[PDB]
Design a protein around this ligand. Sequence first.
Ligand SMILES: Nc1ncnc2c1ncn2[C@@H]1O[C@H](COP(=O)(O)OP(=O)(O)OP(=O)(O)O)[C@@H](O)[C@H]1O
Lengths: 95, 95, 278, 82, 175, 109, 55, 107
Amino acid sequence: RSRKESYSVYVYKVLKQVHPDTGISSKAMGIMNSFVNDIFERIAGEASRLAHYNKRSTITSREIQTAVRLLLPGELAKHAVSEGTKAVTKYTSSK
Amino acid sequence: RSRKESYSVYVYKVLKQVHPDTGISSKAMGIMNSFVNDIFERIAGEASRLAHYNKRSTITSREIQTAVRLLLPGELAKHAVSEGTKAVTKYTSSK
Amino acid sequence: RDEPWKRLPPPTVYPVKEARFEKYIPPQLDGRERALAQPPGQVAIVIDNGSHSVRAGWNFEDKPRLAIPPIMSKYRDRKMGKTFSFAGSDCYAARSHIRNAFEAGTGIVSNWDVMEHVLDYVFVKLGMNEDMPIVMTEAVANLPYSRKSMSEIIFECYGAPSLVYGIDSLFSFRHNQGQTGLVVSSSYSATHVIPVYNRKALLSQAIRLNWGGWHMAEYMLKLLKLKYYTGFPGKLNSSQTEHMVRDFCYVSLDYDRELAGYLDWTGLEDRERIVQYP
Amino acid sequence: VLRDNIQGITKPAIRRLARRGGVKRISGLIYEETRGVLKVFLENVIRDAVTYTEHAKRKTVTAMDVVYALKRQGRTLYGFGG
Amino acid sequence: XXXXXXXXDWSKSLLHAFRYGPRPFDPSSQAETHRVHLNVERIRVPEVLFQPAAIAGVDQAGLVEIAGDILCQRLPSLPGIQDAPDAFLRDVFLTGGNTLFQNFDERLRQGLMALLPVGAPLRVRRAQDAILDAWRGAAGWACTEEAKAAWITREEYLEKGGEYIKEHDLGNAFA
Amino acid sequence: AQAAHQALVEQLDLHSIHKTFRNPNWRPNQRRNKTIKAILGESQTNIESAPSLAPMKHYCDVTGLPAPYLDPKTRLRYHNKEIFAMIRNLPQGMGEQFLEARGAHTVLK
Amino acid sequence: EGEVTEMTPEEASTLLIGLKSARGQKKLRLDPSIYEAIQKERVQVGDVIYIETNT
Amino acid sequence: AKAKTRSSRAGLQFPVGRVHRLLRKGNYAERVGAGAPVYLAAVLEYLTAEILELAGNAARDNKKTRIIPRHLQLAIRNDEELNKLLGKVTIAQGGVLPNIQAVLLPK
Ligand SMILES: Nc1ncnc2c1ncn2[C@@H]1O[C@H](COP(=O)(O)OP(=O)(O)OP(=O)(O)O)[C@@H](O)[C@H]1O
């Protein structure tokens, strides 16, 4: 079995946040999972190359932010960056 | 002085091997250097993804060979695998 | 030109002789009744521990009673809820969890959990309901650990008065009434050459070639796998290639002349041997 | 090894694909060309897929092999993994 | 070519003769694709006993060369025996199961005739029941005085150990 | 229909017959079923195999005919130009299997 | 007729030659003047030769 | 103890040790095999040779004994495989292939 994991439960939670009375099929869920994984690999990769280009051996939130600025086009970036800076602030308000 | 490494002497040696009576310009030298760097990053990247796909933490000559089979097209790949196998065999023999 | 295949005769084809089972389960108990009637000191059970065919019987006869491969197989059925374990020729080669007592390619026993069940099948089908001496064969220059483990299985598992090891080719020498010669014996695992001087083997200088009938079968399988190159629709077992080798191979007298003119068109219809499949 | 199968991509199927693509009128020499293009495409994908399968020392081409092939070819496919 | 022929395939290539035979090609029928043809495998596979290093790449010597090495280079150089060619060549016989091939003893006889000096009374024969005489020899040996003087009883196994060897003239060397 | 096959499976069995002679006091050891390398490593006889030193007649390894010359790209002995054609257009992954059948494949590690 | 098996100088002179045929080899003791006719010919290890014994 | 290079043992020119270091400190895997640097160096050296050869040919064609970017461009854009390999690569100061369509040709 090996406990094959995914981003299922999280996608479901966010779905019920933005739309309480709206469901999702299995195929669409798999597509959302593949989307999450893809963006993850892309951002993390670009962040890795960012750290490597500047001879720095650490991927901080800065590299992630720059990677988002490079990858996500237009407003999608802006909002995302905000949603990041928010999160990392709250994490520093209870740690 | 902070010395910066390059593939200059190596591509020069290769140049002398294949064409003893020809020269090379500085611009074309940098182009060849960037070329070798790009292919290195490509093959090593694809080999890394190959190792990660099969839950392996070691890039052996097999991963490199498969990566070359995936990247280089047709006869180029054939001769590449040929030269690679020859080199790794000759290295295996001569300790 | 229609001539080279117009007057050509219809082919004479041979089917596949795969080593299948055979419908016999004898619980032969008529040997112990004759064995207990002889005077003591002249009754012993002889087991040829052959790599292709373990043979076993009593010494006062001429043919061996049991002649089986070292194949065993054990199962568990959850649709029935029962553990099976039968061995020998009773395996069909429909299920196969086959593992052999001999290591593949060398006549040195190193799969003792199989050899124990093979000897168990031997002592069951001979009839043991209770202590006879055992004469048993081995390979030339056998490893000491294998002899130690075999002796441990003979004494500790079953319980025997005595056993003694010998080389089977030298037994066939002593039965053939020779005194001094050069025994060349090509077995299933290796081909031995042993010089014998006045009924004594000179084992300090015997030489074994590392080729045998199993190597014949495996190399024949490799060449039929590489001859029919684009994919052959058929299960290419090793045993059916062995039965091809048994009845379709002969050592040529003058090899370099026979070989170079072998695939000529004139007369290939009588050199060629053809095999069907279902 | 069966026979042909390049003709398995029948005429009304290609017509359907053109309809979904938004094509009003189709030539007669379109179908063979489409069969050729699809052949080249499938060759390029299956080659890399089988390569990934061989590197994993498997005799069964998995879906993830196809996904990896498509991703490295530059056509990421969602709904199967990766 | 048609104008020249009017004015005037598989049968050329040997690979069709090698895979399929002199008959024409397989039309992908039921009882035609499922056929294996044997041409060279008849004489290539039982030839590895004599030329091992070339056909199958086993880096050892041939049977003829091993027999010649023992008869001509080791046995005359061994002290304690009288006649190296005049005794060992009286009876060279063939025992094992991988021997019942047509024309196997004659090949070994021609090889030893090429190796040995002229005039040696070479007489190569074979056993009577090649796959079953290995059992019958230990059957006839089993209840004699040398076998009685070579058994290992149970208390001898309990005392001497496991790797104990009664040195018989048929068994291996004692240790 | 399958009752005869079931009876043949049932009567051909070892656990169906009670072991009237097996000693139950004996217990098997785990450290068995080794290889020749392991047994030779325990004892550190069977080193009487001898190689050769003689000119070998090299034959073809695609077919069995005598072949006098090899290749630079794939190192295959071959008889004539038909076999050379079939060597230079064979699908990949088999040009190494011919050297596997002949020996000295030297696969990567 | 036959293939030379060995070229062994015995004394220190007489040189034995084994002449291998397809029927059997045979030792042969040579005079120290016929060996200087063998040696002018380029016979090394395994050349088949044709020695007249008388002439 | 008379040290020798790994490139010499592999019969190559490209640095095996350098490639090995880059693979180790390049965030590609936790561990890296011993055949990987020699194999990779061999492939890089081979590709280098294939380009430099055709580039030398193109240089010879223009009566010049020094390979310039133009010669590299002419070498890559003619070799279909090399072109596919460098399809998304722009060679600086390499120009384009002299190619004029048949329709634009004089009547
Ligand atoms: N009629 C036949 N013609 C040719 N070969 C045969 C024939 N019958 C049996 N064989 C061969 O004999 C071999 C079996 O030999 P056998 O079982 O006597 O060896 P073995 O005594 O088990 O070897 P070992 O002593 O190493 O265990 C098989 O490989 C089979 O190919």
